[PDB]
């Protein structure tokens, strides 16, 4: 159950996710998963990043959920659960701004 996950923030807005992630104390890869503001049944993986060009900034990746069961950011790489997706992207940056590291503080 995703509701049970500490990185699942459920129904918060994109702006709020940004407010929480743009904390100077957050290293690259700080993240949270939330409901998409405008797509029923899809989620957003909000991730903090940092470089000298943009400083501290946030990237939002849409996570798709198949009726056929799979979770994915890119259809080429699917998972049986949102937990497995989160675990995979904590080890591989692949197309993300940074691999997932720590859950975002409130
Ligand atoms: C409005 C905005 O910010 N758009 C996001 C997509 C997006 C994300 C969340 C979202 O939330 C709803 C909300 O704000 O509530 C909505 P909305 O519902 O607002 O329309 C739209 C975006 O464009 N992010 C970028 C992220 C950085 C990379 C470039 N890109 C394309 C891409 C390329 C490669 C990969 C990839 C990832 C991992 C491995 C392999 C490939 C992923 C994305 C994005 O999507």
User: Three-state SS for 19?
Assistant: helix
Q: What is the experimental method?
A: X-ray
Query: What distance in Å separates the CA atoms of residue 14 and residue 46, rounded to the nearest whole number?
Result: 8
The count of structural domains within the chain is 1
C-alpha distances out from residue 55 to 18, 32, 80, 94, Å: 14, 20, 35, 21
Is the CB of residue 81 less than 8 Å from the CB of residue 63?
no
Residue 4 Cα to ligand 1 middle (Å): 24
Whether 36 is in the pocket of ligand 1, judged by its Cβ within 6 Å, is: yes
CATH code for the domain of 77: 3.30.505.10
Whether 38 is in the pocket of ligand 1, judged by its Cβ within 6 Å, is: yes
Query: What distance in Å separates the CA atoms of residue 26 and residue 100, rounded to the nearest whole number?
Result: 12
User: Three-state SS for 9?
Assistant: strand
Cβ neighbours for 72, distance < 8 A, ≥ 6 positions apart? 63, 64, 66, 78, 79, 85
34 bridge partner residues? 10, 44
56 bridge partner residues? 50
93 phi, psi to nearest 5 deg: -80, -40
Closest of 93, 65, 92, 97 to residue 79, by C-alpha = 65
Q: Which domain holds residue 25?
A: 1-106
Closest of 82, 99, 67 to residue 7, by C-alpha = 82
Tokens 């989620």 belong to residue:
43
Query: What distance in Å separates the CA atoms of residue 69 and residue 60, rounded to the nearest whole number?
Result: 22
DSSP 23-66: -TT--TT-EEEEE-SSSTT-EEEEEEEEETTTEEEEEEEEEEE-
What is the number of the ligand 1 atom nearest to the C-alpha of 61? 8
């Amino acid at each position: 159950s995703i509701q049970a996950e500490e990185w699942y923030f459920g129904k918060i807005t994109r702006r709020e996710s940004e407010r929480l992630l743009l904390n100077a104390e957050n290293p690259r890869g700080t993240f949270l998963v939330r409901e998409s503001e405008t797509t029923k049944g899809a989620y957003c993986l909000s991730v903090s990043d940092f470089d000298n060009a943009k400083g501290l900034n946030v990237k939002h990746y849409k996570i798709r959920k198949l009726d056929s069961g799979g979770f994915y950011i890119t259809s080429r790489t699917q998972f049986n659960s949102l937990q497995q997706l989160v675990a995979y992207y904590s080890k591989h940056a692949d197309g993300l701004c940074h691999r997932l590291t720590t859950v975002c503080p409130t």
